Amino acid sequence: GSMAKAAAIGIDLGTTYSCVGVFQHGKVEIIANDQGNRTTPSYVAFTDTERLIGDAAKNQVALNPQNTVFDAKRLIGRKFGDPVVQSDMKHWPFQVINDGDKPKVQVSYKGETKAFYPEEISSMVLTKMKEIAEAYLGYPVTNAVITVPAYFNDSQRQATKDAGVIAGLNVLRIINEPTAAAIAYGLDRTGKGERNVLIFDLGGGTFDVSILTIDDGIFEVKATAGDTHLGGEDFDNRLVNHFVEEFKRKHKKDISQNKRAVRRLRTACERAKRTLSSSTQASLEIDSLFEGIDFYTSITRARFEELCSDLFRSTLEPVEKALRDAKLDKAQIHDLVLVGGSTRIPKVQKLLQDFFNGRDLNKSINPDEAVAYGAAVQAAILIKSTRAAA
Numbered sequence: 001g002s003m004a005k006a007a008a009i010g011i012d013l014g015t016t017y018s019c020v021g022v023f024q025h026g027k028v029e030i031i032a033n034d035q036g037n038r039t040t041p042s043y044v045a046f047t048d049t050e051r052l053i054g055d056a057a058k059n060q061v062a063l064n065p066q067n068t069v070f071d072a073k074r075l076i077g078r079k080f081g082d083p084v085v086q087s088d089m090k091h092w093p094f095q096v097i098n099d100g101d102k103p104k105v106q107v108s109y110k111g112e113t114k115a116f117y118p119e120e121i122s123s124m125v126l127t128k129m130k131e132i133a134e135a136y137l138g139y140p141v142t143n144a145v146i147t148v149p150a151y152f153n154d155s156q157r158q159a160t161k162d163a164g165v166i167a168g169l170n171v172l173r174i175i176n177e178p179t180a181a182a183i184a185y186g187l188d189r190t191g192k193g194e195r196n197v198l199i200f201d202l203g204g205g206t207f208d209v210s211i212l213t214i215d216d217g218i219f220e221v222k223a224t225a226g227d228t229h230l231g232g233e234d235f236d237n238r239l240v241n242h243f244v245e246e247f248k249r250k251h252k253k254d255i256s257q258n259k260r261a262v263r264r265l266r267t268a269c270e271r272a273k274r275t276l277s278s279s280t281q282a283s284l285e286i287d288s289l290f291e292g293i294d295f296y297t298s299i300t301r302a303r304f305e306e307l308c309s310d311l312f313r314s315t316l317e318p319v320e321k322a323l324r325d326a327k328l329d330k331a332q333i334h335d336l337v338l339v340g341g342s343t344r345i346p347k348v349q350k351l352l353q354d355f356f357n358g359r360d361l362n363k364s365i366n367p368d369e370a371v372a373y374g375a376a377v378q379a380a381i382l383i384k385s386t387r388a389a390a
């Protein structure tokens with residue numbers, strides 16, 4: 001008769017990390033990769049012998065910075081001359097070249113110099129997400145919903161579809177990341193009447209606020225605001241500068257010129273930062289950090305909060321701006337949704353909850369998984385082909 005259909009997948013193709021989910025048995029499963037990670041770095045590395053994608057690429061970045069590509073989403077669908085591109089290039093260790101006013105990343109790969117369009121790098125990340133899903137499902141996957149930022153234009157959306165097509169995926173639809181996070185909570189399933197939803201998305205490197213209106217399951221983007229210079233990496237930087245100063249006071253040594261020591265410090269700082277989201281203090285223990293000196297210390301959540309205090313407070317400026325743009329008052333927002341791992345920070349949650357006069361925040365779906373979750377819900381809806389009964 002009719003052979004069972006393969007499940008369709010939802011992919012959050014993120015700037016720093018990507019996530020894949022599948023809706024089955026009335027629920028979403030966020031799929032872990034083979035290293036047990038529920039999110040996969042959006043990284044691709046090139047060597048003389050291999051092309052590594054995800055954790056394998058990110059884990060070898062220290063010694064191969066010129067041939068490990070990340071942040072391709074910041075280049076996707078943009079012109080080489082775009083001022084965003086020109087500024088971002090100064091921070092990247094890999095080469096970005098100009099091919100007819102279109103940026104390409106240029107690397108050493110399998111004995112040759114090779115250049116790739118941003119959509120080709122993103123297709124490599126999408127190929128890894130498809131394989132992660134296929135390892136769990138136990139069969140080939142064809143259909144996917146891929147998400148993008150609400151501010152992406154036509155060129156950026158088409159280049160994302162192109163990345164999916166290069167990866168061998170049939171792209172069912174390109175949907176906005178804030179819309180997918182709202183779908184994850186079933187905010188489009190509450191019946192008739194308008195609901196105003198604010199999505200608070202704090203990433204590794206950028207912060208996005210979106211205001212959506214949902215009426216009878218129909219989404220309208222009312223306002224977008226944010227800060228391109230606010231993310232998790234800025235909190236890691238504050239901890240790095242703090243501990244560099246601490247080592248100077250305690251051992252009368254400046255470690256800041258040994259890249260390995262700084263990198264080991266930053267890696268430890270990011271993990272201590274994550275621990276501080278669940279505990280009121282966290283230890284930092286690095287053996288032979290610099291000149292054979294063991295660095296065994298601690299940091300309280302209160303000190304970390306003081307170190308990043310201005311940065312956390314600045315998340316409320318784009319919230320106020322988005323509300324003015326949407327012509328809405330804070331009391332008129334029905335739902336608050338958290339997106340991004342950095343939203344697990346208790347102080348970030350408290351500042352936003354206090355701003356909205358004590359309101360509950362939707363954070364029950366892991367914030368680094370909500371976008372893929374919503375994309376998986378939509379992918380299952382889009383492949384339905386029910387024929388009406390008489």
Ligand SMILES: Nc1ncnc2c1nc(Br)n2[C@@H]1O[C@H](CO)[C@@H](O)[C@H]1O
Pocket residue numbers: 016017203204205231232233270273274275277340341342343344345368
């Ligand atoms: N529990 C957590 N508490 C604080 N921060 C976190 C947590 N989990 C994640 Br994930 N992050 C940060 O989210 C960003 C994602 O690119 C990175 O800056 C991560 O450090």
Ligand SMILES: [Mg+2]
Pocket residue numbers: 014015177203340371
């Ligand atoms: Mg995201």
